[PDB]
Amino acid sequence: GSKLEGKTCGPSSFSCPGTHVCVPERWLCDGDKDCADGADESIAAGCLYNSTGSGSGSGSTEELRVRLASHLRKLRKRLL
Ligand SMILES: [Ca+2]
Numbered sequence: 737g738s739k740l741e742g743k744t745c746g747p748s749s750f751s752c753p754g755t756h757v758c759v760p761e762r763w764l765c766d767g768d769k770d771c772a773d774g775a776d777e778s779i780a781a782g783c784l785y786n787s788t789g790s791g792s793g794s795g796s797t798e799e800l801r802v803r804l805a806s807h808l809r810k811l812r813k814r815l816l
Contacts, residue, residue, distance in 0.1 A: 738769060738772075748804070750763075753772070753773065753780055761801055762805030762809030763809060765799075766810070774786075
């Protein structure tokens with residue numbers, strides 16, 4: 737979609753609405769509309785707020801779904 741260099745949709749992931757592409761759950765509330773319409777950061781993906789709070793909002797739960805994946809999705813792809 738946007739900054740997606742070929743991710744997966746198996747584990748904690750989210751299918752970028754409108755595009756066959758699938759953005760990881762960690763990318764959701766990462767703070768950057770990776771999807772075509774920021775669906776990844778939007779609530780449609782499960783950000784529990786969409787934008788509001790950048791990388792959080794409702795509470796720890798928001799980071800619980802994102803952070804938990806920050807050790808693989810973002811800490812294991814093909815950039816570093
Ligand atoms: Ca993203």
